Structure 1
């Protein structure tokens, strides 16, 4: 590369501001890829003492999707330590109270349990809607691809694929439907 020593070190250990989108994505897969980028495990120069984390900006956090019935089944439990501090709220209640708490807690759980976790959490940025601050937008590099594939509802199918799909059965002519 023929760089000088200080610019070469700066280029090797510089930080990157990855972008990630919510909008019908599973919070666990978002948390998995965000936690990899926050740990810096995507870099070949990774080491736990090298401070090689990167910034992750997740948007559309309000529009996450849960597989199955997890919106009612999944329970987040906390304890304000006064006698009776035990509170249990469903994922739906937590989402309607705080729109980013579910993805924040998922990334916090997936991050390694050491003293660097709060620093990686500080480097994580979350936003509930399409609005992002201008400085972060000017920082952003590489919107990462979404894990899910947006299973594409019926009404926005094009007529070409609708009549390309063959009809499976012949209805009787005397049926009310």
Structure 2
């Protein structure tokens, strides 16, 4: 409050840079978060015509995780336009080809199907690994919590935690195991 008109408007309608870490995250949940931010539906001043979308930088998109057998079952379909140009590629093959395609397509499908969609997609920055360009890193403002909490492995559990968990059963001594 007490700002001048132009600075106040600039602050209100400024676009913020968010960071998502895609490691072990479902591309769909990443895409939901990113699509909300790209549309600007996270802002109370939101309106379809106010162009109030924000920048989303998703890193480690190479390390996304699909639930179920989606890596093998989910099929991405495209057509080159030419006869016989129908191409159907499983998620695993598409991921091996382009380590950004799966998250990009998820976000593209979640965004509203209008002319603003590609302007929004211009504000989406996908990076396969931990590396991010220096200018993007300097732009970053906030990091969004990962939608899925990564379960711990036994190798990661501490011996104290293992001990704290009770033993469930008495194994017979005379067993090879």
Structure-1-length-normalised TM-score: 0.99
What per-residue deviation string (whole Å, max 9, x for no partner) do you get for residues 31-81 of structure 1?
A: 001000000000000000100000000000000000000000000000011
Shift of 1:114: 0.3
Partner residue, 2:20? 20
Shift of 1:9: 0.5
- Structure 2 length-normalised TM: 0.99
Cα displacement (A) at 1:86 = 0.3
Distance 1:156 1:93 in 2: 30
> Is there any run of 5+ residues in structure 2 with no aligned partner, and where?
none
Deviations 1:105-162 (A, max 9, x none): 0000000000000000001100000000000000001110001111101111001110
CA displacement, residues 92-115 of structure 1 (integer Å, 9 cap, x when unaligned): 000000000000000000000000
2:105 match: secondary structure: helix
SS at match of 2:109: helix
Report the 3-state secondary structure (helix = DSSP H, G, I; strand = E; otherwise coil) of the residue aligned with 2:166: coil
Aligned Cα RMSD in Å?
Answer: 0.4
Residue 35 of structure 1 aligns with which residue? 35
